[PDB]
């Protein structure tokens, strides 16, 4: 509680990625929220300030409010570790593995975390021949996702152009069975806060998620397992589908979620009476 | 080819790990080998120079001759990516996963790369009961190995072996008996031969033998599978994959190394020399993959 325990804090935000503008907003609010708590927090945009200034100006820890690019892929995590600066959320492995959808799914398959069945296609494959085999094996519809803009494919005839197009963006393309007839949900994770699931509606976000309490409790538990087996910690989201029968299938994790005053973790927290400042203090307190 | 194409090159070496002295040796030889090729290469010890100096003094790429610690685990790779400096070997995912035994083996199991069966101990649990059930499930001997090394030959000695420990997660791996231990060095498309690793007590200290002693057809197939074992973890371009054979010649991969030694007694220069590729050529080949 004593804000002095946090010492001098950098709020990392902005950056060089396509999500710079969202990160500017996140970081401004995180900054406000930490200062509201009396914490000695300062803005630090690594696209503008030398990263060596963190150590040189006596910064001891950072709230990472970057999104995309080096803020989320293990790169700035590795650099912060190298410089001795503590930081929020996941470390190098968890950040890098969380962004690799292919290897995230292999680890889930080996650890009992359910995930939709999928095939891979390599750049330079006979995409038409692969498409035929994959429809025979998985059925339709399918999502075609780069391994590290997702396309939904509803007919067999549309699949080869989708593979070819995805292969332009990644040497490896994931072709994943779509889970139909249920719903889409996300579990926000912030320490051991009991944040409610959020249902994602075909763009709109719904709390309560519409599920019975016992099912919600189990799904939050499995979602935390899905996150922790990839080496992620403390802060993020796990996205998943249910089918019509209520079986869960995990899609991906997010290790750098938004902190705009309407992004999902603040919404989930506000719904249980935890305000924005309290949420950011809680997340930062995990670095103590 | 044209040395000017590499621009200004840092050789990262030294560092702060327990293997600093081997890195010092490797880095001194790599530096000389790049210079002998006419490349504009300079020493850069990150334990002594600020990493900001790379970008500030106009370095465009680095040969990573660090071993262990931040040179191998993705930390310095992330920092270099952050600074826009190209570097040899694996990037952040491959480097961090190649040091994580638990997830390395899960990925190998899900992708058909053979690896010894294993159990995890959460410490955590009753080490006495886990030890009993692991011996039942796996057999003996076992290795107790960090998840993120002790060879145990009786069931009695395991609970204590577990007690000692990463921590929270312990790997208990079946030992592969009656064959040999081997390594496959990887350097771009060089067809580097396998090397047999022979413990000092079995050589009538540790000895490295080329040729590895296996028939050509088998060696060809093992080089291919070893490259796949390295590549499925996200590692690229430069490193080793280590494996055992049992008595019948079945292979089991044990681990990868993404920052291998470059002394005159290290494995990649020996594998390369045996196919007529000298040291200077090997370092230029590795660096060329950064173009």
Residue numbers in the entry:
A (entry chain A): 4 to 151, 157 to 210, 226 to 311
B (entry chain B): 4 to 151, 158 to 174, 177 to 215, 225 to 311
Q: Can you list sentences taken from the study reporting this PDB entry?
A:
One strategy that has been employed to improve success rates is to “rescue” such proteins by adding orthologs from related species to the pipeline, based on the assumptions that many of these will have slightly different physical properties that may improve their solubility or crystallization, and that close orthologs will have structures sufficiently similar to the original target to be useful as surrogates in drug design.
Using only seven Burkholderia species to select orthologs of essential genes, we solved structures for 49/406 essential gene families, and for 56 total Burkholderia protein targets (including seven ortholog replicates).
